[PDB]
Amino acid sequence: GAMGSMERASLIQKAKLAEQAERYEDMAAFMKGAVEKGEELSCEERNLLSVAYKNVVGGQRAAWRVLSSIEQKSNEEGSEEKGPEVREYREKVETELQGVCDTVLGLLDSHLIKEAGDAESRVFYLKMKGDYYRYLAEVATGDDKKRIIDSARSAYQEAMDISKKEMPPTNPIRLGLALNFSVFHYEIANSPEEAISLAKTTFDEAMADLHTLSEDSYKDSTLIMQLLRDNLTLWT
C-alpha cells in the first residue's frame, strides 16, 4: 500500500490535518494506512476512521441519489430518449461507492473485528459493518440484495446484543447504533413499525438513565436522543 512507508503516528497526525482541511479522501487513505499497520485502534483513532469514510461515502451516496433521480425521470412516460449516458454515469458513481464500502468492510474483516474484545470497540466496528452493508443495500438491485440486507441485519443485531449486555442505555455508541438500526428497519427492511418501536424504546431507556451522568455525558447522550426524537417525529 502507498502508506506502507509512513509511520503509524505520522498517518494519524496527517489524518487530523486532513480533517481540519476537509480533505476527507486523504483522511480516509491515511487512516486505512494506519489500520494496515496491524495494531488495534484507540477510541480516538476509531473515530478518525469512521469520520473519514463517513464523509467520503456520504458524498458518493448524495451524488448517487441525484443521478438515480434523474435516471428514474428519464424512464417516465413522455420522457425524451437521451441515450445511455445517465445510466453509465450513475453506474460509475455506484461502482466507486461500492468500492469504498468494500474497502471499509475489508478493513473490518482483516482484521479489526476479530481483535476487538472490549464492548466499546467491538460494538463500534459491528455498527460500522452494518452501516456499510446498509450503504451497499441502498444501491443493490440484483440476485444478492437479500443477502446484502441480511448481512447488515446480522452485524447490527450482534452489535445490539453486546451493547444491551455490556453498555448503559445512555452510551453514545449504543444510542447511535440503535438510531442507525432503526433507519435500517424503516428504509431497507420495509419494517417501519420495528423502526419506530426501537427508536422509542431506545429513547425512553436512555431518558431514565440520564440522572446517573455528569453534565458532559448528559450533553453527549441528549444530543443523540434528539436525533431519535427527530426520526420519531418524522415517522409518526
Binding site: 438510531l179 442507525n180 428504509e187 443523540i224 436525533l227 431519535l228 427527530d230 415517522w235
Partner: peptide
C-alpha cells in the same frame, strides 16, 4: 420534511 437522521 427532513432527511431522517443517521450517525
Amino acid at each position: 420534511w427532513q432527511w431522517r437522521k443517521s450517525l
